[PDB]
């Protein structure tokens, strides 16, 4: 169990080791980040939202988020997208990432997208979805949809 972005993450299956890696942001800043390598499954519980997360090396496999309102659901999605370490998120950064107490690089990334996530969501990718009991899609602009969704993401009740 650990905490990230105001969410408690508890690992329900799988595992990971960490390898340092250099990466190039969409503002062309180089960062050394600790990459988690492994298939892992988690629950996330924040103050206003809950989720199930399955991921692998720099890849979000599935996120099912349950939340109180649009605002809360969004915050959960942003934390799980940054936590995924996917390169479309790395490449969505605009402006430099300063400092820093307080802030290893994953937190810097998070603080950046928490100030504004529009570009993160635009660039993530969408997919058509099927009908699944208790599950609905969320579009890049955060409105609901039965036909499409942000890739890997679904909203529960």
Curated annotation (Swiss-Prot):
Spans through the membrane: none
Cellular localisation: Virion; Host nucleus
Domain of life per record: Viruses
Function: Plays an essential role in transcription initiation and cap-stealing mechanism, in which cellular capped pre-mRNAs are used to generate primers for viral transcription. Recognizes and binds the 7-methylguanosine-containing cap of the target pre-RNA which is subsequently cleaved after 10-13 nucleotides by the viral protein PA. Plays a role in the initiation of the viral genome replication and modulates the activity of the ribonucleoprotein (RNP) complex.
Membership in a protein family: Belongs to the influenza viruses PB2 family.
Assembly and binders: Influenza RNA polymerase is composed of three subunits: PB1, PB2 and PA. Interacts (via N-terminus) with PB1 (via C-terminus). Interacts with nucleoprotein NP (via N-terminus).
Protein's name in the database: Polymerase basic protein 2
Source species of the chain: Influenza A virus (strain A/Chicken/Hong Kong/YU22/2002 H5N1 genotype Z)
Segment of the intact protein contained: 322 to 482 of 759
